[PDB]
RNA sequence: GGAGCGGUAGUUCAGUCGGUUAGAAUACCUGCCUGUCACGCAGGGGGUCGCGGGUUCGAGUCCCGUCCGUUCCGCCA
């Protein structure tokens, strides 16, 4: 029904007669003068309508805003005059010699002269998705996809399959299950990631992998969490992680090249650890040029214990956070902050205003002071670096509240302040992350996944000192985002099985949840190693948008909920009955 | 499970530490306009303040319950 799109229609087409295919974006009415700016997918194409065509002219009176029109005309130079610049096809525009409408559109329930809700977007999605600035990033994304495939492929990795239907088994996020009508009583999980599987796939010969593919969560949201999101996964044999994260570091090095013409150039590295210290997070931002000092050393005998504590204590710590500038936030500002810690645990934000450090005491402001001295404080002034007019903020307490609190306080603070460049691109591997993460009930968690080798331990060592044990895990982190992750794999049955122990999993639990991996672990299992980076990260941080639901078609809203077609919804009791379950009174 | 913010014509935004015909923009309808591109110009109708309950002389404004969106904590192979 169309002959040419209107957003690709140039001077070069000046004289052809053509038919297009679209809605109607704009539409000015001069009485006996049309103006109709017809887009579709490649843009806004003028088309005119005049008396001398009465009937045309008459019939474009009816156009409103989105109605599906198709229409035939000839494409001719407009004025120089006329011209828009701001237009791809401003050069030119189509004489209408034909009109025919093929939908008209109701009342629309955005109105695109607004900024509309979040909610009515969804509602509403079909209609958004019209926006150029939301088809763009799915345009975009569909980019992305086909550059990953053809450089996976190129690289050798087979996109395999996996299944969606698969088994329920422990660790990780929430599964979604999905009941049996065949089997009564029994269900099957979505997958969180296709994990076992390609593990599997490499226990198969296949000897690179990756896929594109849905993985389900059953967990709350957030700007940068979507409960079925989609990965680009990827797994390989025969390789370590260094190996592993040179391919992986090159795709992303890629898409940003052939995406954004950007070279993110070579990927900064950093453990675990230092992320930890430096920056009190696992996926720190680097655009933000701000620290942590740790200065629990200089606070163990004062008699404050707020710092006392943490100071002394080996699972505590004292974390100065240096604030350019700080020193000129307003109580209300500083009360803010501090509310802002408790969000993370912190029982309260101890800080030290730098007015004159020449000063001493009396350079200071500091509801803290007094629980110090003037050597401490120039200890602290001097470590941090402190300078004249700016603000130093305290987290003193257990490890983690301290990260926590302060590497979000950091975070916040940079951009309040506008420390943080914005511009930048910062791209970096963070690795030597832990083996596990203590469960707060005497246990221990996987920190990536039950599957992951230990770096340089056997599986006796491991079993004999596992909270220290490193994990041979790795995270690709993008302007403070996680974008991917991954880890070399157990390859050995004794160590997987070992693991399973030290995670509180019994035999019984082992046999039954990954038995089949246990049992495919005895077969000439290569070592392997993968990762897996999560496709609508990519896609927000390459259209810049923070934003997941940017990126993604029909999104679920933080109810896990599709605006658009009302799901989920009431079940058919038809339906409940042959799946053998029920709503619980 | 928790905290913050929003919920006002079709859409969107404002709405004074509570004052009684609810403001506008946009949209829509009508009329005029032969070079608009955010066209312009002029007139018209439209919501009863997400929902239920309550305080009060009076509630869009306050309180409670609750629903929806959203941000975050918890949570997150
Ligand atoms: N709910 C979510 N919404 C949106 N994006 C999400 C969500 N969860 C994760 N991501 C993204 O996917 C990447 C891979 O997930 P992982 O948990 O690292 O590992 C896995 O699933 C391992 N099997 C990979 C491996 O070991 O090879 C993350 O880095 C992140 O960007
Ligand atoms: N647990 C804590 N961690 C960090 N700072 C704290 C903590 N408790 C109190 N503070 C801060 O230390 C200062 C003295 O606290 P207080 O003695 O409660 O007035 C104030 O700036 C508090 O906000």
């Not at 963070?430 to 056997?458: Q, R």
Request: glycine share 8%; net charge negative.
């Amino acid at each position: 029904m169309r002959t040419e799109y209107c957003g690709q229609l140039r001077l070069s087409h000046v004289g052809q007669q053509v038919t297009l295919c679209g809605w109607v974006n704009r539409r000015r009415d001069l009485g006996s003068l049309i103006f109709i700016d017809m887009r579709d997918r490649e843009g806004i194409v003028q088309v005119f309508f005049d008396p001398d065509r009465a009937d045309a002219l008459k019939l474009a009176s009816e156009l409103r805003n989105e109605f599906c029109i198709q229409v035939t005309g000839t494409v001719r130079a407009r004025d120089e005059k006329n011209i828009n610049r701001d237009m791809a096809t401003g050069e030119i525009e189509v004489l209408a010699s034909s009109l025919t409408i093929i939908n008209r559109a109701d009342v629309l329930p955005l109105d695109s002269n607004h900024v509309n809700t979040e909610e009515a977007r969804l509602k509403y999605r079909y209609l958004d998705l019209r926006r150029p600035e939301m088809a763009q990033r799915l345009k975009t994304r569909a980019k992305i996809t086909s550059l990953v495939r053809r450089f996976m492929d190129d690289h050798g990795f087979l996109d395999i399959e996996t299944p969606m239907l698969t088994k329920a088994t422990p660790e990780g996020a929430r599964d979604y299950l999905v009941p049996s009508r065949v089997h009564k009583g029994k269900f099957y999980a979505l997958p969180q990631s296709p994990q076992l599987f390609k593990q599997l796939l490499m226990m198969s010969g296949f000897d690179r992998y990756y896929q594109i593919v849905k993985c389900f969560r059953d967990e709350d949201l957030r700007a940068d969490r979507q409960p079925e999101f989609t990965q680009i996964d990827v797994e390989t044999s025969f390789m370590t992680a260094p190996q592993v994260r040179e391919v992986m570091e090159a795709l992303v090095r890629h898409l940003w090249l052939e995406v954004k013409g950007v070279d993110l150039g070579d990927f900064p590295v950093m453990t675990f650890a230092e992320a930890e210290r430096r920056y009190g997070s696992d996926k720190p931002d680097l655009r933000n040029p701000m620290e942590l000092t740790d200065v629990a050393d200089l606070l163990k005998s004062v008699e404050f214990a707020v710092f006392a504590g943490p100071a002394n204590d080996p699972k505590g710590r004292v974390a100065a956070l240096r604030v350019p500038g700080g020193a000129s936030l307003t109580r209300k500002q500083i009360d803010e902050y501090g509310n802002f810690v408790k969000i993370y645990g912190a029982k309260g934000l101890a800080y030290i205003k730098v007015n004159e450090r020449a000063k001493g005491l009396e350079g200071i402001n500091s509801p803290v002071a007094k629980f110090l001295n003037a050597e401490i404080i120039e200890d602290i002034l001097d470590r941090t670096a402190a300078q004249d007019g700016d603000m130093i903020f305290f987290g003193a307490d257990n490890k983690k509240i301290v990260a926590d609190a302060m590497g979000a306080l950091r975070l916040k603070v940079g951009k309040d302040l506008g420390l943080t460049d914005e511009s930048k691109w910062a791209p970096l591997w963070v690795i030597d992350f832990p083996m596990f993460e203590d469960d707060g009930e005497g246990g221990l968690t996987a920190m990536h996944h039950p599957f992951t080798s230990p770096k340089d331990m056997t599986a006796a060592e491991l079993k004999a000192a596992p909270e220290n044990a490193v994990a041979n895990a790795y995270d690709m982190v993008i302007n403070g985002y996680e974008v991917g992750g991954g880890s070399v794999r157990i390859h050995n049955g004794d160590m997987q099985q070992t693991v399973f122990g030290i995670l509180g999993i019994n035999e019984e639990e082992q046999r039954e949840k990954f038995g089949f991996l246990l049992d495919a672990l005895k077969y000439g299992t290569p070592p392997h190693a993968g990762l897996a980076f999560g496709l609508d990260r990519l896609t927000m941080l390459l259209t810049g948008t923070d934003n997941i639901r940017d990126v993604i078609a029909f999104p679920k809203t933080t109810a896990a909920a599709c605006l658009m077609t009302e799901a989920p919804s009431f079940a058919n009791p038809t339906a409940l009955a042959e799946l053998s379950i029920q709503v619980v009174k």
